[PDB]
Amino acid sequence: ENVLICLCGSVNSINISHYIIELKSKFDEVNVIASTNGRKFINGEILKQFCDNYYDEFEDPFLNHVDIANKHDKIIILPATSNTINKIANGICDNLLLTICHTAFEKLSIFPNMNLRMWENPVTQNNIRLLKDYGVSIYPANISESYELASKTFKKNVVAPEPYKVLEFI
Amino acid sequence: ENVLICLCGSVNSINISHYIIELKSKFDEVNVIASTNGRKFINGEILKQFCDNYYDEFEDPFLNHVDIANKHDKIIILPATSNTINKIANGICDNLLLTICHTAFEKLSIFPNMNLRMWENPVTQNNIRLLKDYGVSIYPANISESYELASKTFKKNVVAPEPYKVLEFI
Amino acid sequence: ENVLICLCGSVNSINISHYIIELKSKFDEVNVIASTNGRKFINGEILKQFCDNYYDEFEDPFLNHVDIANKHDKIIILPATSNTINKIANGICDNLLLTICHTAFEKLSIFPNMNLRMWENPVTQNNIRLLKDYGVSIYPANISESYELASKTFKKNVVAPEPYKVLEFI
Amino acid sequence: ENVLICLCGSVNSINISHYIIELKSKFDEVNVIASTNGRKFINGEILKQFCDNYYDEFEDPFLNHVDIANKHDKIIILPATSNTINKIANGICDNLLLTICHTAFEKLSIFPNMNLRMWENPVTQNNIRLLKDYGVSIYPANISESYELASKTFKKNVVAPEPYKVLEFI
Amino acid sequence: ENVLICLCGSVNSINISHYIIELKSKFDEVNVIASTNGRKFINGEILKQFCDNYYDEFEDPFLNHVDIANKHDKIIILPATSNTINKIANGICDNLLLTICHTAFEKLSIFPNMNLRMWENPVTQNNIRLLKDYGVSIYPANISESYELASKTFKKNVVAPEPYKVLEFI
Amino acid sequence: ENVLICLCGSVNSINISHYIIELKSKFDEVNVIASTNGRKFINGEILKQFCDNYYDEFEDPFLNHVDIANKHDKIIILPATSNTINKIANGICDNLLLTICHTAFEKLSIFPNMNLRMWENPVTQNNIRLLKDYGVSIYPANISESYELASKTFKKNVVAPEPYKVLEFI
Amino acid sequence: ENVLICLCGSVNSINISHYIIELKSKFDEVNVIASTNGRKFINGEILKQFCDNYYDEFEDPFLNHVDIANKHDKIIILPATSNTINKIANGICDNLLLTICHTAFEKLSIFPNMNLRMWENPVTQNNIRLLKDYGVSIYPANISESYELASKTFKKNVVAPEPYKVLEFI
Amino acid sequence: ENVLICLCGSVNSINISHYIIELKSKFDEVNVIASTNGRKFINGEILKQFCDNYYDEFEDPFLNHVDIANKHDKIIILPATSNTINKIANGICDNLLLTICHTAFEKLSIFPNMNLRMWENPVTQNNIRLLKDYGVSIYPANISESYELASKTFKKNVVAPEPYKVLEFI
Amino acid sequence: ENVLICLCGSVNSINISHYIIELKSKFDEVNVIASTNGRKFINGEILKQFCDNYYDEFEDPFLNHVDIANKHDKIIILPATSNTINKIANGICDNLLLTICHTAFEKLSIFPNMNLRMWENPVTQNNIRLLKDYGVSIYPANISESYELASKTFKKNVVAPEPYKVLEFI
Amino acid sequence: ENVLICLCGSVNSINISHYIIELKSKFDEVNVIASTNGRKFINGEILKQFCDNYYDEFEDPFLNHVDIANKHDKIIILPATSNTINKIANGICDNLLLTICHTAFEKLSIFPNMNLRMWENPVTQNNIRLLKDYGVSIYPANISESYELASKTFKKNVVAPEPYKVLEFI
Amino acid sequence: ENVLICLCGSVNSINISHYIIELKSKFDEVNVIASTNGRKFINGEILKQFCDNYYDEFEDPFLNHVDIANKHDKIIILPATSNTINKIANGICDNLLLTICHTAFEKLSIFPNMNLRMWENPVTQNNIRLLKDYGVSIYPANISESYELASKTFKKNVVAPEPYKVLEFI
Amino acid sequence: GENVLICLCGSVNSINISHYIIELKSKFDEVNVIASTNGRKFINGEILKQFCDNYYDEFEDPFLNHVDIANKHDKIIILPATSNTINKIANGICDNLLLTICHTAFEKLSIFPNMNLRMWENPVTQNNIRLLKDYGVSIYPANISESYELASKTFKKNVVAPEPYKVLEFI
Ligand SMILES: [Cl-]
Ligand SMILES: [Cl-]
Ligand SMILES: [Cl-]
Ligand SMILES: [Cl-]
Ligand SMILES: [Cl-]
Ligand SMILES: [Cl-]
C-alpha cells in the first residue's frame, strides 16, 4: 500500500519528515507533493531523504495526475490550507497537487491547518461541508491556541494533528 | 465571421491544427489562445502556420479581453479541461483565456476533454449544470476507453469530438 | 486607524495615488498591496512616495496575511476586478492579497471595476450577493459609459468611485 | 495635427495620463517619450493605453530624431526637470528626448517642474533666459508650497500647470 | 524489432504522433530523434507521450550513434528535408541524426518532403539517384498540389505518405 | 522587380550599403539576408537604414524560404564565400540563406569573394563548374593582389566587383 | 553637523577613508556618494566601514536629492573631476551626485583633482570662475608634479589636499 | 606620427574603414574610439581589421585618457555629432572619448556631421565659435541635400567630407 | 617548422597530449584547433599546458584562416571523423578548422578514426579517393576490433596511429 | 543573554526550529548561522520564523565575526560535523561561522553529530582532545544505531541530543 | 570488488582513463570522484566513457559519503595533491571527496603527485607520517626530474606511478 | 632586480595595500599581488594594477601555476595576514592559489599578522605561529594596539600590519 502526502503553503509543512517517517512503518511507499505556493516552505532534497518519490511538476511538468492517483491507495493533504480546501471544493486544479486530488475524492483525506479566522470563514465552512458530502474525509481538527514566535503574539489555529493520529485516521 | 479557439492543458491540444484547418471552411478568422498551463502542450509558431492570430499573454500582457471577445462571434474551449470548466463556472479568470470566456458566455461553447474520474466528479457535474443554466453550450461528449501509450494502460475519457462535429455544434 | 488598499489588474489602478493622498487625511497609515496580475499595472516605487508600506510578496514571500490583516481597521479592494471578487466569494486565496481579504470579511469593502458584461455575468452577480450575505461591504456602482482611448470605442463599465465617495463609504 | 510629450525624471510624470486625455481633444496624435532617467517613474504599457505612440529608445535604439521631430507640430516637456532644461540650454543631447528637442526649438514648449532651490539656481535661471532668447516658450510657472507625503515636510517647488493650462499655452 | 524515426525541419513533423501510433502496432520500440533545425517544429515531451525514447543531442551530447543505430532494425527519415537528403548523400554528419543515418544505410528509408522546386533541384535529383545506388530506400513520393494556409497560396510538394504506407514500405 | 542580397562571412560584407544604394536605382525592393557565420560581420540595424527587409532567422526562425524566394526576381550572393558556394553546389541548406538559394537556381547569381588558395582548390572549381551547368550564374571574378592591413601581408584574392558591375551582371 | 563627501572618477578616491576618518573628528555624520563613473574606483562595503551612509543610486534609484541635501550642513566634492566641475557649472545633473550638488550651491566645496591639461583647459577655468561667482567654494588647489607608476611617467596635476586642509577649508 | 579617430552616434560612422585605410598612408598608427552612443553603429572587430588599436571603455574601463591623448599627434572627431560638439565646448566628459578630447584641444580637429536644423541651432553655433576661439580646428563643412533611403525624404545635412579631404585638413 | 593539429569529435581526442609531446621534438610550434563538435571532447586549458597556441573560434571569432594556414608547414587531422573527412572532400567549411584545411590541401595529412561501418560507407570511400587525387595524404590506417568500455561490446574501427607513426607519415 | 546556534552540513540541521523554540525560553535572542555546506540543508526563511537573526554571509558578506561573537554569551555548534570540528581545532576559518567560533573558544559548546567511522577517525579524536584542552565544551554524545530511510541500511552515529539536554549543557 | 579513484587538482589527472581501463581488469566497478579544484582538469563525460559512476557533488549535492565509502573495497587518491594530503591528515573534509576518504582510512591508498618543494615541505612530511601511523597506505614515490612544456623548464616532482604499479600496491 | 609578491588576505587593512606597493617599488623591481579568495571582496583588482606590476587572479586565470609564480619571486609576504591563512599555512592546507604559492616557498616567506587580539591569542594560532617559526617562516613581531573602530563604534585590540617602512626593513 502506497500513500501520497500533499503539502500546502504553511509553516507546518517543515515537520513533514516526522510524518514521512511514521507512515513508512505501515505503507510501502510514502510519496510527497507540494502546491506551487508550498515549494518555498520546503526543501526538495531533504524530503527525498525520507519519502520515496518527490513529484515536482516544475522539474517534470508532464507528470500525469491519473497515473499518480492510481498508484496510491491513500492521498492526504497535510497540512491543508484554506486556499487548497476551497479550490478542491470548487473543482479548481491549476496545479498538479490539486489535479491529483480532483481525480480521487474517494481516496482523499484532508488535515485542516490554518488560522481560526480562516477556518471560521463562512465560505470555508460550507466548502468543508460540500467535501464531507462528496465522500472526502476531514480530520476533526481541534482548535488550539499558541504563542507564535514570528509575530510575538498568541494565534488561534486549527492544526495538523500528531503523526500517529494521521496513521489512525487513514 | 470569426471564431476563437481556447486550448487548455491536455495532450489533445496537439491535434488543434486539424480543427483550425476545418474551421477555416466556415469562418473568416480562426484565432487561438492557450491557458497558461496549456502553453507547454503546443508550439505557438506552429499554430501560426494555420491560425490568423495567436494571442499570447506572456508576450503581450496588456491584451484586452473585451476587445478580443467582441471581435469573435463564437468562442470555443477545445479541449476543455476540468480545471478550466470549474473555474469558468465559478467566475475565476486569473488568465487571459478565462477572462475572455467570462466576458462572453452567450458566445461560449465548451468541449470537455478529461479522464472519466474528473468528468464524474460531483463538483464538475454540478458546474456543468450551472454553465448550461447560464446559457453556455456544452458539447455532449461521448465516453470512450482507449489504450494510452504514455501509461501502457486503458483509460476512460470524455474527448474532443472530430472537427466536423465541432463545425455542426456552433 | 490604518487602512489597506488592495489593487487588482485594472487600468484604474494607475489613479491609486489620489486615493492614498485623500485617505491619509483620515487614517494614520495608508498601506497597499497588489494582486499578482495587478503588479504590471502599477509602479511600486511611485506607490511608496505616497503610501506608508507597499506589501510585495515577490520581494518578500513570507509576508504573513494575519499580521497584515490585524494591523488594519479597514481593507478596501479598489479597483476590484471580477476575478478577485469571484475568488474571494469562493474562498480562493492563492496570492497574498486574496489571503489577507479571506481573513477579514468583517473589515472588507469592495469597489467593483469591470466591463458591463462581467458585471452582468450571473456568477459575478451571484457571488456579489453571497459576499454581502457574509458581511462584506460592496459599493453600489452604477453602469457608466465612456470613450476608451485604448480601443477607440465606447465602453460600458462599473467604475471605482471618486476618493471622497470611498472615504464616505468605508 | 500632432503633439509629443517629453517626460523627465519627476514624480509628476505619474499624472501624464490626464494630459494625454486632454491633449487628445485637440490633436490628431498624442505621442510620448521619456528621458532615460524618467523611464523609472512611469509604466510604458499604461502609457500606451492613452497615447498613440510611446517612443522607447531602449526597445528601438535606431529611432530617428529628425523624423520624430518632423512628425510633430508641438513638442512639450512636461514635467521638465532642471537637468533636461540645462542640458537643452547647452545643446546636450545624449538621449533621444534631448536630441528630438535640440532639433526643434521653434516647436518647443517647456513646463518647469522642480524644487525652488533648483529653479532659483543662477545657472538654471541663466539657461531659462537663453532658452527664451532662442525662441523656446517656457510656461510662466509660479512657486507653490505643499506638504510632500514622501518626506513628511512642506516643500516649495515650481510645478507643471494643470492640463487645460497646457492646452491654453501651446 | 525496433524502429527509429528521424524528423527534419518541416511543418509536417507535427503529425509525427500518428506515424508513431501506427508503427507501434508492428514494432516493439518506436523511438524518435530530430535534426537541429527540426527541434523547433516539435515538442519533445509531447513526443514522449507516444514514443519509447526521444534522443536529444542537446540534453545528452554524448549519445552514441553506433549504439543507437545497432538497437534499431529499421531507420526512417520522415519527413525528410532536401538538406538532410543532400547531407546524407554526401557523408555530412554534423548532428546526431545524420551521423546515425551515416552508419546504417542498409537499414535506412527516406520519405522526401519538400517543395517541388527543391525536389526538382538537379543536385537533389542526383543525390536521390546516388543514395539508391548505395542501397538506401527512397519512398516513391508523389507530387501533390495544395492550398497552404500560411502563405495564402497553392504550393506544389512531395509529401510524406500516409502512416499505413510508411508501415508497408518498411 | 525585387532583389535579395545574401551576405556571407567575409569582411567585404561591410561595404554592402554601397551595393544596396546602387541596387535601389533599379529594384523596387532590395532585401538582404546573412549566413549564420556572416552575421558577426554586419550590423542589422545599419543594414535596415538602406534595405527594405533584413531577414533574420535568429529573430524569426520560421521565415519561409519558398515565400522569400518567390518574392524575388533575382537572388545574389555577394560576397559569396567558398563555404557557401560549395554547399549550394552539394544541395546542403542548414541555414535560411542556403535554403532560399536552393529553391531558386534559376534566379541565382554568385560573386565569388575569397583568397586564391580557396578559389584554386579543385573541389571549389569542380563545384563552380557544376553550378554553371545547373543554371546558376557565376560572375567571372578576376584575380587581384592587395596589401591587407589586418595581416600586414600582400594577399591574392578573388573579390566582389564594384556595385555598378553588379547591376550590369543581373 | 553633517557633511556629505561626493567622489568622482579618479584614483584619488581610494584614499577617501582617511578623509572620512578626519571629518568624523568634527562632524556628527560623514556620509558618502559616488558619481556613476566614480563607482568603479571604490568599494561601497569598504566605504561603509568608515562612513555613516553610503548613498547608492543603483541600489535605491528613488533617493531624493532635496532630502539628502537638506540633511547636510556641508557638501564636498573630493576628488572633484573636470567633468563633474564642468557639469555643475552648467546645471547638468544626470546622476544623483550632481543633482544633490545642484540644489546646494551655498553648502558646496569643491577640491579639483585632475591632470594639468584638464585644469588649464580654458572651459574648465571659465567654469571655475562662474562657480565662484555663484558662491561655490573652490579649494585653491596647488599644482604638484610626481612620478606615476601606472604610466611610468611624470605627470602634473592639481590634487586633493591633505585631510587636515579639507577640515580647515569647510 | 599617430592619429586617433573618435566616432560618434552617426550612420556615417560605417564608412570609417575607408578613412582608416587613407590615414594609414601618412600615419604610423591609426587608432579608434567610439562614444557610448556610437558603439551601436559600428562593429569593433571589423574595426580592428583596419585600425591598430580599438579603445573600448566597456571592455577596459580604466583606459587612461591622458596616456591615450599623449600617444597621438592628432585627434579627429569624425563623424562629430552635435551632442559631442556641444559637450566638448562645455567641458563635459562623462565618457572616455569626451575626456581624451577635453585633455587635448590643441591636437583636436572636428568634422561636423548632422542634420541642418542641428547645425543651425543657435546653441550649437555658439559652441562651434567658442571651440575655434579655444584652438580647436573645425572643418568648413558644406551643406548638402540628398535623398535618405531610411525616411524616403530629402534631408539637409552637414556631412563629414571625403577621406583625402580629411588628410589635407589635419 | 610549425605543425597544426585539428581535433574532431572523437573520444580519441583525449589522447592528443601524447601527440603534441611527440611532435614538439621535431617542430618549433605545435598548435591545436578543435572542430565545434570536438570542443566537448577536450579541455582547452589542459591542451594549453602542452601546445603553444590553441585556436578557439568561440573566444576569438575573427581568427583568420589564411594567416593560420600560412604559419604552418604541416597540418594534420587527428583523430579525423567521417564528417570532417566528408566535408573537406566536398569543400564544406562551416567552422574554422575546416576553413584552414580548405586553404591548404597540399599541407594536409588525415588520420581517419571512425567505426568500420562509417569507414566502409561508399560515400566516405569515395571522398577518401577524391582527397588523395587532390594530393591530401591519408594515413593507411588499419582496421582493429576492441572491447569498448562505454557500450560493453567489441567494435571495429579504424584508429588514429601512435604518435611516432604520426611523425613518420607527416 | 543571547545564544548563537551554528549549523553544519548535516540532515539533523532540519530539526533546528525545535532547538530555537526551546532556547527562546531561556535566552532573549536566539540567533542562527550556517556553514557554507549547511546552507543547502536549511531554509533561511523558515529559520527566520523562529530565530531572531539569521546571519547570511552570502547576502551580507561583511558581517563582522568579532561583533557577532561579542553579542552572544553562548555559541553552540549543532549539529556539529567532523569537518567543522577538525577545522576549528586547527584554527581554520574560511567561512563566517568558523571565524566566529575561532574568536570565542571560552563561550563555545560542540554537539557532535556524524557517522561513527568519522567520530572514531583518530584525527577527529585527537582534535576533540585538543579542543577540550583549549576550553571548549564537548557534549558527551552517546553512540546510537538506527535505520536510515535514505540508504535502507542501519547506521551508527554520534548524534545531536534532544533540545532540553542542550539547555542543560550550555 | 569495487574501486574508487579520487582525482585532485593536478595536470596528471588527464591520464586517469588509462588508470580506469587497467583497473577494470581486476575490479567490477571502477568509479571516480574529483575534488572541487580538480574538476577543471578533467572532462566528466569523457570519464563516464570509461568509469562506471562519476560522482559529481556540483550536479548532485546530497550524495552520501558513507554510502559511497561502504560501496567500495579500495579507495585511491591519484593523483594526490599536497593540499588533499594535508587536509586528510588534519580531518578537514569540506568537499565530498575529502569526506569519503575521512570515513575510510583503512581502505585508503595515496599516490602523491607534487613539486619537490611541496613534497619536501616539513608539514607535508609530518602529515604523510601521521597518515601512515593511522593506517593510510602511501605509495613510496621517488623524486624524478622532467622537462615541463608549460614552463619551458625542468621540474622536479614526485608523480603517480604507472597503472600496473597501482594495481600491485592496492 | 629582486621581485616581491604581496599576498592579501580578508581584512580591512588590505585597503591600504597601494601604500605598501608604492614603497616596495623603491626596493624591488616588480611588486606583484595576489589575494585570497575571501580577500578579493576587500580590494579592487584594477585599482591594484595602477600600482602593482602583476595582479594574479585565480578566478580570471584558473591555471596559474604556483611553482612558476613562487620561483619568479625572491620574497613573498603575507600582508595583512589573517588568522585563517596563518593556520592553513601552518597545516599545509592550500585550497587556493595564494596558499599554494606559500606552501611551495616557506624559505622565502614573511607573515605580517593582522587580527583581533582574541584570534591572536587563540592557542591554536599561537601554536601555529611557533611551528611556522620552527620551519623557517619569518613572522613580523607584530605590534598589539587598541583603537576606536568606527564600524562597531567600540574599542578593539588588534595585532596590526606595520607601516610600509617596517615591512621594507623586515624583508
Ligand atoms: Cl525636485
Ligand atoms: Cl518546403
Ligand atoms: Cl587626470
Ligand atoms: Cl565512431
Ligand atoms: Cl605541483
Ligand atoms: Cl579581526
The answer to whether the CB atoms of J20 and A50 lie below 8 A apart is: no
Distance E66 CA to ligand 4 centre (A): 7
Q: How far apart are CA G110 and CA G100, in angstroms?
A: 14
Residues of J with CB under 8 A from a CB of K: 36-37, 40, 82-83, 85-87, 89-90, 92, 94, 115, 117-118, 121-124, 127, 150-151, 153, 155
J43: nearest CA partner in chain C: C62
What are the chain B neighbours of E45 within 8 Å (beta carbons)? 40
d(CA L68, CA L58): 14
Contact predicate E111/E5, CB 8 Å: no
Sheet with E114-115: strands ordered across: E114-115, E153-158, E143-148
DSSP secondary structure string, I61-113? TT--HHHHHHH-SEEEEEEEPHHHHHHHHTT---SHHHHHHHT-GGGEEEEE-
Q: What is the largest CA-CA distance in chain H?
A: 44
The string over C145-169, giving b where at least 16 C-beta atoms fall within 10 Å of a residue's C-beta and e elsewhere, is eeebbeeeeebebbbbbebeebeee
Q: Are strands J30-34 and I143-148 parallel, antiparallel or unpaired?
A: unpaired
Q: Where are the domains of chain H?
A: 1-170
- The bridge status of strand I153-158 relative to strand I114-115 is antiparallel
Residue F120 buriedness (CB in 10 A; 0-12 / 13-18 / 19+): middle
Cell 546636450, residue? D92
Judging contacts by C-beta atoms under 8 Å, the chain I residues touching residue H54 are: none
Task: Quote the cell numbers at residue J4.
Answer: 548563537
Which grid cell sits at D139? 510656461
Question: Which residue bears the cell 632586480?
Answer: L1
Contact assessment for residue L167 and residue L20, using Cβ atoms and an 8 Å cutoff: yes
Given strand H143-148, what is the order of strands in its sheet? Answer: H114-115, H153-158, H143-148
Residues of G contacting chain D (CB within 8 angstroms): 61-62, 64, 66-67, 69, 89-94, 99, 102-105, 130, 134
Give A161's contacts (C-beta < 8 A, 6+ positions apart): A111, A139, A141, A142, A169
Contact present, B51 and B22 (Cβ < 8 Å): no
Residue H143 and residue H151: Cα distance in Å, rounded? 19
With a CB cutoff of 8 Å and minimum separation 6, the contacts of K79 are K7, K8, K10, K12, K13, K111, K112, K113, K159, K160
Contact across the interface for D48 and B62, Cβ inside 8 Å: yes
Do the beta carbons of residue J165 and residue J19 sit within 8 Å? no
J143: left (phi over 0), alpha (psi -120 to 50) or beta: beta
CA H95 to chain centre: 14
B/e letters for G58-69, b = 16+ CB within 10 Å, e = fewer, are eeeeeebbbebb
Q: Are K120 and L106 in contact (CB under 8 A)?
A: no
For residue I113, the distance in angstroms to the closest alpha carbon of chain H comes to 36
The method of structure determination was X-ray
C164's enclosing H/E stretch is: helix C163-169
Which ligand is closest to the CA of I159, given by its number?
A: 4
Q: Are strands G143-148 and D108-112 parallel, antiparallel or unpaired?
A: unpaired
Residues of J forming the active site: 65
SS3 for chain A is CEEEEEECCCHHHHHHHHHHHHHHCCCCEEEEEECHHHHHHCCHHHHCCCCCCEECCCCCCCCCHHHHHHCCCEEEEEEECHHHHHHHHCCCCCCHHHHHHHCCHHHEEEEECEEHHHHCCHHHHHHHHHHHHCCCEECCCCEEEEEECCCCEEEEEECCCCHHHHHHHC
How many angstroms separate the CA atoms of K39 and A42, rounded?
Answer: 30
Grid coordinates representing E96 are 546526431
Nearest Cα of chain F lies from the Cα of I149 at a distance, in angstroms, of: 34
Q: DSSP 3-state assignment of E144?
A: strand
Quick check: L132 and L86 in contact, CB under 8 A? yes
Distance K95 CA to ligand 6 centre (A): 26
Instruction: Report the separation in Å between the CA atom of K89 and the middle of ligand 5, taken as the mean of its atom positions.
Output: 19
Cell numbers found for residue J64 = 563582522
The helix (H) or strand (E) run that includes residue H146 is strand H143-148
Question: After which residues is the backbone of chain A broken at C–N > 2.5 Å?
Answer: none
Distance of CA B114 to the CA centre of its chain: 12
Report d(CA F12, CA L144) in Å as an integer: 70
Task: Give phi and psi for B159, each to the nearest 5.
Answer: -135, 155
The residues, ordered by sequence, that sit 6+ positions from D70 with a Cβ below 8 Å of its Cβ are: H153
J70 contact partners, CB below 8 Å, separation of at least 6: none
Beta-carbon-side half-sphere exposure of residue C122 (alpha carbons within 13 Å) = 10
Q: Taking CA atoms, what residue in A is nearest to K62?
A: A45
CA–centroid distance, G66 to ligand 1, in Å, is: 7
Torsion of CA C108, C113, C119, C125, to 10 degrees: 0
Q: Is B77 helix (H, G, I), strand (E, B) or coil?
A: strand
How many beta-carbon pairs under 8 angstroms link C with J? 4
Please name the member of E21, E43, E150 whose beta carbon is closest to the beta carbon of B49.
Answer: E150
If you search the block for the grid coordinates 522539474, which residue do you land on?
A59
Cα gap K165→C163, rounded to integer Å: 88
Q: Of B92, B145, B100, B81, give the one whose Cα is nearest residue B2.
A: B100
For residue B79, cis peptide bond before it (omega within 30 degrees of 0): yes
Question: Per DSSP, which regions of chain C are E strands?
Answer: 3-7, 30-34, 54-55, 74-80, 108-112, 114-115, 137-138, 143-148, 153-158
Looking at the DSSP bridge assignments, the partners of residue J112 are: J80
Q: Which residues make Cβ contacts (< 8 Å) with residue H15, sequence separation at least 6?
A: none
Of H83, H89, H122, the CB nearest to D99: H83
Place of cell 470579511: C105
Cα–Cα distance, B20 to B14 (Å, whole number) = 11
Sign of CA dihedral L169, L38, K6, E59: negative
Q: How far apart are CA K45 and CA I161, in angstroms?
A: 24
Could you tell me if D57 and D30 are in contact, meaning their C-beta atoms sit under 8 angstroms apart? Answer: no
Position B110: which residue type? I
Q: Are A109 and A76 in contact (CB under 8 A)?
A: yes
Question: In the CATH scheme, what architecture does the domain B1-170 have?
Answer: 3-Layer(aba) Sandwich (3.40)
Count Cβ atoms within 10 A of the Cβ of residue J106 and give its class: 0-12 exposed, 13-18 middle, 19 or more buried.
exposed
- As a whole number of angstroms, the distance between CA I15 and CA D148 comes to 73
Q: Cβ of L51 and G21 within 8 Å?
A: no
Distance B21 CA to ligand 2 centre (A): 19
List the resolution, Å.
Answer: 2.0
A102 CB-side CA count, 13 A: 31
Task: Among I11, I40, I46, select the one facing K14 at the smallest CB separation.
Answer: I46
C-alpha dihedral (L89, K130, K1, J81), degrees to nearest 10: -60
Classify L1-171 by CATH class: alpha beta
| Secondary structure (3-state) at K49 | coil
The β-bridge partners of L32 are: L5
Torsions phi, psi for E9 (to 5 deg): -85, 80
- Between CA J63 and CA J42 the distance in angstroms is 20
> G–H contact (≥3 CB pairs within 8 Å)?
yes
What distance in Å separates the CA atoms of residue G106 and residue G100, rounded to the nearest whole number?
A: 12
φ, ψ dihedrals at F73, nearest 5°: -90, -35
Closest to H139 in 3D by CA, of H111, H168, H166, H164: H111
Beta-bridged to residue G144, according to DSSP, are G157
User: How does strand I153-158 pair with strand I143-148?
Assistant: antiparallel
> Which residues, listed in sequence order, are joined to residue D49 by a DSSP beta bridge?
none
3-class secondary structure, B144: strand
